[PDB]
């Protein structure tokens, strides 16, 4: 049930029943951590961190190996993102379509898509304000959005 | 309709159903060990890889991402794990 799409897809990940690390995995809980630290220093998002470990190093779930999530581990070391990843990507998309809308005055659909994107931004901003992740004075402005990201 | 036991499904039934519509969810993917030519060091590669995997020793292109299962290079040898 997508918010702006009538169709309801079912494509998603299915976690296995077992939570124990496989025997063939030769990496330790400590050794995974600096790999996360090294890749984060390179400038990769935490969602991208898991994909690299999954594809190449055979780490199916970092939470099962180290006992902590990627964001929690990075927060402890101090490599914390300034803004939440999900909110940051939507702001980046809003800037890109807004820049495109300057040079195409007749693009009606681009105007409509911008409404949907900013609606999702306000919904996540209100939720992120409640969890005290964002200060209770942060606002999304079109001119400020370029400087934000 | 045909009579099926919801508690005890048949061997061909559970492997045929969708991964989310089974009694207990179970993925259809797996991990495999690949051996590239040029150097016979073993690399662990996910089946539905989304990035090109390079051998650590010799930097040879192992697999190319596709829509579904990743396609392996010619001459490579692979084995399912676990």
């Amino acid at each position: 049930g997508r918010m702006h799409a009538p169709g309801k897809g079912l494509s998603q990940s299915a976690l296995p029943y077992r939570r124990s690390v496989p025997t063939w995995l030769k990496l330790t809980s400590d050794d995974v951590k600096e790999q996360i630290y090294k890749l984060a220093k390179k400038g990769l998002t935490p969602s991208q961190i898991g994909v690299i470990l999954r594809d190449s190093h055979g780490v199916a779930q970092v939470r099962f190996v180290t006992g902590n999530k990627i964001l929690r581990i990075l927060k402890s070391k101090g490599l914390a993102p300034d803004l939440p990843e999900d909110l940051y990507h939507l702001i980046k998309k809003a800037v890109a379509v807004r820049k495109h809308l300057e040079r195409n005055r007749k693009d009606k659909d681009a105007k409509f898509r911008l409404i949907l994107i900013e609606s999702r931004i306000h919904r996540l901003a209100r939720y992120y304000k409640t969890k005290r992740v964002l200060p209770p004075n942060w606002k999304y402005e079109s001119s400020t959005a370029s400087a934000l990201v | 309709p045909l009579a099926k036991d919801l508690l005890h499904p048949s061997p061909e039934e559970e492997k045929r159903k969708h991964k989310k519509k089974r009694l207990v969810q179970s993925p259809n993917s797996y991990f495999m060990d690949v051996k590239c030519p040029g150097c016979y060091k073993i690399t662990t590669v996910f089946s539905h890889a989304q990035t090109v995997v390079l051998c650590v020793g010799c930097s040879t292109v192992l697999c190319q991402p596709t829509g579904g299962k990743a396609r392996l290079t010619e001459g490579c040898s692979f084995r399912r794990k676990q």
Binding site: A80, P81, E85 | -
Partner: peptide
């Protein structure tokens, strides 16, 4: 195949995502 990844390195390698990426940039 290697060339196609290198074109995608610009999008997937960010320069202002983390908080540390701002503070060492301000120096």
């Amino acid at each position: 195949v290697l060339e196609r990844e290198r074109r995608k390195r610009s999008r997937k390698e960010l320069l202002n995502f983390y908080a540390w990426q701002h503070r060492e940039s301000k120096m």
